[PDB]
Amino acid sequence: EMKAVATSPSGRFLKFDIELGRGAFKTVYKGLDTETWVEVAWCELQDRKLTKAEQQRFKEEAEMLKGLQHPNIVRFYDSWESILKGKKCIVLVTELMTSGTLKTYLKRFKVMKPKVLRSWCRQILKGLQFLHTRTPPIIHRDLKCDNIFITGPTGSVKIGDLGLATLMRTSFAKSVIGTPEFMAPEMYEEHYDESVDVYAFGMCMLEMATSEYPYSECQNAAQIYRKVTSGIKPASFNKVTDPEVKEIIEGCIRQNKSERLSIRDLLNHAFFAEDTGLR
Amino acid sequence: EMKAVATSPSGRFLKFDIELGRGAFKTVYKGLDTETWVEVAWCELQDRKLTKAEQQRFKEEAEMLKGLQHPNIVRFYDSWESILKGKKCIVLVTELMTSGTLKTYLKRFKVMKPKVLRSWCRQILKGLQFLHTRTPPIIHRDLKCDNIFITGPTGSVKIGDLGLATLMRTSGTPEFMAPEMYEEHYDESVDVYAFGMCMLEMATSEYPYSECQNAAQIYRKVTSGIKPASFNKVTDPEVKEIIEGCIRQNKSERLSIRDLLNHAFFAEDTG
């Protein structure tokens, strides 16, 4: 009756044949929560030939994401494996962010305004502080302007795509010294903590402030790797003259992770000051 | 040892126009130490584009390699850069292992003999024991039968190609990826693991996980704790038990190098 073309296994969500966006290996359709009449994003992720072990790991992660409620985290409703009409995919139902990503929204503007930067970055930081104070802490690990989302008519900014990079990871991320047949399993382990999100946040803030992609002077990741592992900042950093924004970004992208500010230290900066209910 | 065709910058080593073999990233020629008249390996490496930083690092690492003197480590003499057929290459002079790698030597034989396995593996362990007890410890990180070498007429077995994997290496989101994400984490037990796979390769005459079609399947099995198919083709139960003790998933459960050196299977042939 709704002009819907599909229903979730639970029956709770409808899919409409209305495409709202296209990213790499995913299509976002307009959906509807039949219980609340709230419009939602019905995201179809191309099957990445996942095994039975990986499918189990994401199912436990997906159940934990369902519980996250925070104003700066995109809400996660449900997920399942679909094979309708012979198309194999994973469906994710999430909160619908009508203006897409910050990367997409920023394409409409020439120069960043300081009041906008303050508002967007404060919201991102509040979402990260929420994630880092869960039990156990959640580390995003892949924060960028293309997975932070915005709703144009409110200016609400929310972090999205939690767990997506691990779910869609086609190969082992980076190359390691060794021969696979002889390499112990612990050589594939990844060592990181909350400060990887602090570093990513600083690069996001630099991108927003300068309206350009960091390290665009490098022709390939080999040069980036050599610059980054040498502690050389992106050239776009030289364009930041506002001393507060400069000191904020500097405190995030320090090479030594133990010297970076925490998310709460960043939220304490006078640049992000707001109102506390005290007058 | 007549008619040299090149000399090292120092004047110490001569190159003869005699190609002894090819290896990982290298062509090996017969050379000579003019000071001692000992024949050596003159190894010409494939050209690599190294920054001024990486070049300095290799120079400092090479100077440390000169100090590693042990009967089961291939001795490193000298290195430099040379223009070879128009391209800048690294030349290394090392001890000459006349029979090549264990992998090559094994191709001449059909079935591994236990006394041979015990002798080759005991020598690899003594080499690892030496490397791991340097100050600071040296972890090989790429131990395999293709960079362990042998001299046929003595049965002497020596670990080589130290640091060659890192020198010859080539190629989250990169622009947003914190520098610590590029760090590699490992300790001495990664060499114990590779030793176990080396022992498996010798005992069965095939690469471990040869049933896998590509690296991602190996990654899936190794992270899952699934052993190579060749592990169950090991006929000797004592060899099988040692291999299992080296390739345990939890590195803290693996045998130490001292455990392996003092295992009865590797007891010296004094009687």
UniProtKB/Swiss-Prot annotation, chain B:
What exactly does this protein do?
Serine/threonine-protein kinase component of the WNK3-SPAK/OSR1 kinase cascade, which plays an important role in the regulation of electrolyte homeostasis and regulatory volume increase in response to hyperosmotic stress. WNK3 mediates regulatory volume increase in response to hyperosmotic stress by acting as a molecular crowding sensor, which senses cell shrinkage and mediates formation of a membraneless compartment by undergoing liquid-liquid phase separation.
The record gives the effect of mutating K26M as: Abolished serine/threonine-protein kinase activity without affecting ability to regulate localization of SLC12A9
Report the subcellular localization: Cytoplasm
Assigned protein family: Belongs to the protein kinase superfamily. Ser/Thr protein kinase family. WNK subfamily.
Effect the entry attributes to changing P71R? In PRS; uncertain significance; results in decreased SLC12A5/KCC2 phosphorylation
Note the superkingdom of the native organism: Eukaryota
Disease implication from the record: Prieto syndrome: An X-linked recessive disorder characterized by impaired intellectual development, developmental delay, autism spectrum disorder, variable epilepsy, craniofacial dysmorphism, and structural brain abnormalities including polymicrogyria and cerebral atrophy.
Enzyme active site: D161 (proton acceptor)
Q: Which residues cross the membrane?
A: none
Q: Protein kinase domain: which residues?
A: 14-266
Assembly mode = Interacts with WNK1 and WNK4.
* Residue(s) carrying Phosphoserine: S171
Q: Where is it expressed, tissue-wise?
A: Expressed in brain, lung, kidney, liver and pancreas, and in fetal tissues including placenta, fetal brain, lung and kidney. Very low levels of expression were also detected in fetal heart, thymus, liver and spleen. Isoform 1 is brain-specific. Isoform 3 is kidney-specific.
Reproduce the free-text note on domains from the UniProt record.
Answer: Disordered regions undergo liquid-liquid phase separation (LLPS) for the formation of a cytoplasmic membraneless compartment that concentrates WNK1 with its substrates, OXSR1/OSR1 and STK39/SPAK.
Posttranslational modification, per the record? Answer: Ubiquitinated by the BCR(KLHL2) complex, leading to its degradation. Ubiquitinated by the BCR(KLHL3) complex, leading to its degradation.
Q: What is the effect of changing L167S?
A: In PRS; likely pathogenic; results in decreased SLC12A5/KCC2 phosphorylation
Q: Which residues bind ATP?
A: T94, E95, L96, M97, K144
Protein name as annotated: Serine/threonine-protein kinase WNK3
